[PDB]
Scaffold this active site. Structure first.
Site: not given
Length: 301
Positions: A162, A166-167, A180
């Site tokens: 992912d 945004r992470n 995470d």
């Protein structure tokens, strides 16, 4: 479940993270925590700002009172994965944990500038390529640090699944740290995650083999890194802007459609994006190649 996986040679397969060891060296006295503001919250958990006496300001991940038995186990497995990974400057690092005397608490590093996506969108009309403006020098450093952090995860046989702006969290001195969220983020409220079957997936960041064949590998992480680069040099624009995720979108990706170069992307950085987005996973660069390529760019700059 959208989260990190450690893999073992089988051809790899995910390891069951419950089977990882938890070393009690991480244990930290619960009473030495003073909790502050809630930094983020999902359906089953939250991260809170906290002051740690004798460990400084830290982030503490915890479950909400409605969490089921499996999610307490999941938070424990999150702690086991962080402890297994070890320390690196460009990930959010484990600092301590509280496992006995109450509900599980995971103590991690605190990043005061929040996630990188909102930071870029914040700084979009304050950007100049060359000379507190955001500059091309900053975007190159961010690309470099995220590649280093991803190279570190890959070297520990860990795949993110992912990767996205945004992470990535930003802290002092412009250090970017991969993270995470896990149970501290509920993706049902984010339009960047798309329903597909029963699952909710970040389709616009995923490699084609992940979308159409459910294959997640080190090479599919590189694809997502190329999307991250597009986000970075578009100053936080959404990928494939204005395109709904529908049958036409999947067909275009499958037939070789890729995004155009962002306005502020140097040609050398767009070259990296294009190779990250090769339909053949074997032709994509590794994160170690990307680190060296960006290192040469920064020297030339």
């Amino acid at each position: 479940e959208v989260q990190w996986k450690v893999v073992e040679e089988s051809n790899y397969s995910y390891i069951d993270p419950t089977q990882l060891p938890y070393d009690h060296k991480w244990e930290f006295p619960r009473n030495r925590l003073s909790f502050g503001k809630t930094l983020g919250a999902g359906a089953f958990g939250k991260v809170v700002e906290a002051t740690a006496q004798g460990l400084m300001t830290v982030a503490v991940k915890m479950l909400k009172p409605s969490a089921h038995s499996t999610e307490r186990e999941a938070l424990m497995s999150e702690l086991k994965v962080l402890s297994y990974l070890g320390n690196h400057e460009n990930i959010v690092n484990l600092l301590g944990a509280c496992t006995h005397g109450g509900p599980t608490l995971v103590i991690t590093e605190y990043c005061c500038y929040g996630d990188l996506l909102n930071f870029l969108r914040r700084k979009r009309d304050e950007f100049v390529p060359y000379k507190d403006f955001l500059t091309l020098e900053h975007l190159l450093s961010f690309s470099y640090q995220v590649a280093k952090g991803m190279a570190f995860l890959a070297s520990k046989n860990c795949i993110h699944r992912d990767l996205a702006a945004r992470n990535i969290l930003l802290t002092h001195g412009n250090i970017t740290k991969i993270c995470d969220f896990g149970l501290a983020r509920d993706i049902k409220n984010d339009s960047n995650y798309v329903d597909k079957g029963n699952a909710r997936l970040p389709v616009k960041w995923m490699a084609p083999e992940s979308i159409f064949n459910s294959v997640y590998t080190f090479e599919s992480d590189v694809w997502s890194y190329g999307i991250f680069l597009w986000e970075l040099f578009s100053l936080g624009s959404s990928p494939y802007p204005g395109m709904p995720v529908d049958s036409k979108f999947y067909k275009m990706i499958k037939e070789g459609f890729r995004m155009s170069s962002p306005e502020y992307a140097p040609a050398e950085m767009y070259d990296i994006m294009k190779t990250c987005w090769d339909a053949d996973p074997d032709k994509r660069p590794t994160f170690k190649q990307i680190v060296q390529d960006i290192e040469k760019q920064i020297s030339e700059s």
